[PDB]
């Protein structure tokens, strides 16, 4: 249930699930130092 | 400018 959410929440079919990155997510990851 | 949707969704 929540805590996280629907268990498989936040993993995108077209990206995470296929190990593909979208064009600007790296920007985010890089800002976390 | 919104295209119409299936009448069925208004009800």
């Amino acid at each position: 249930t929540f805590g996280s959410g629907e268990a498989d929440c936040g993993l995108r079919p077209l990206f995470e699930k296929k190990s593909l990155e979208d064009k600007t997510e790296r920007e985010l990851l890089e800002s976390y130092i | 400018d919104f295209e119409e949707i299936p009448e069925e969704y208004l009800q």
Binding site: T1, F2, L11, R12, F15, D22, S31 | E3, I5
Partner: protein
């Protein structure tokens, strides 16, 4: 979204569109957190100052979209609402403090490559990610300029700003239930959410487990992308107990 780009297909599978049946118009953005629950900003549904008070029957929720105006046959799903719950202490009189609402759908939706829920944060994730300097992402079909609307979903990545800076950019009283984000005038980069984007998600990607979490809801701003100004978002983690409660009560 101002100074943002077109999203990629399936980039934000949790993005929802609140659609009005008569007139048929985009009302606000929203997010899919379950197969039966949508999360939005309470001011998109109830805002007495302008005489706005929408009920179940006046809205439609459209999930799986990319194009703003077209009925994407075989891709998006349109659900009707069963119930709407507004936070009991939503403050429309003064600063839109606790600007959150939950909508229960008539039937569960099925996930697809374009429809998938977002995760809600937990204390630890909020703690480690909600730090000034860290960037989040906002999406929506809202205005492209303060003073038109895009053909597809737009996206922009913005840094979280130090609370002092947020408070010193406005006259409004900021509470612990909001945070602000955006670039400072001496940063070069621009970007902000705008009218039409209200209700949608501000999300971050955890570098620990690779999941996307929704940290904020687009709440308000003064103008769109003005220098010295920032966008304010509802702090989802601080209101989580309310979320859990209605979802495990209804």
């Amino acid at each position: 979204i101002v100074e943002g780009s077109d999203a990629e297909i399936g980039m934000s599978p949790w993005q929802v569109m609140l659609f009005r049946k008569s007139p048929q118009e985009l009302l606000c953005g929203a997010s899919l957190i379950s197969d039966r629950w949508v999360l939005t900003a309470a001011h998109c549904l109830l805002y007495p100052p302008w005489d706005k008070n929408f009920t179940e029957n006046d809205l439609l929720v459209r999930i799986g979209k990319h194009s703003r105006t077209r009925y994407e046959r075989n891709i998006e799903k349109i659900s009707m609402l069963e119930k709407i719950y507004i936070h009991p202490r939503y403050n429309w009189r003064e600063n839109l403090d606790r600007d959150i609402a939950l909508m229960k759908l008539k039937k569960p939706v099925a996930f697809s490559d374009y429809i998938h829920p977002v995760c809600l944060p937990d204390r630890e994730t909020a703690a480690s990610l909600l730090q000034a300097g860290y960037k989040g992402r906002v999406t929506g079909w809202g205005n492209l300029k303060e003073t038109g609307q895009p053909s597809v979903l737009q996206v922009v990545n913005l840094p979280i700003v130090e609370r002092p800076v947020c408070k010193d950019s406005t006259r409004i009283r900021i509470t612990d239930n909001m945070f602000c984000a955006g670039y400072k005038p001496d940063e070069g980069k621009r970007g902000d959410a705008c009218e039409g984007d209200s209700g949608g998600p501000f999300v971050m990607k955890s570098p620990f487990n690779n999941r996307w979490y929704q940290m904020g809801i687009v709440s308000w701003g003064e103008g769109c992308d003005r220098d010295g100004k920032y966008g304010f978002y509802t702090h989802v983690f601080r209101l989580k107990k309310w979320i859990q409660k209605v979802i495990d009560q209804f």
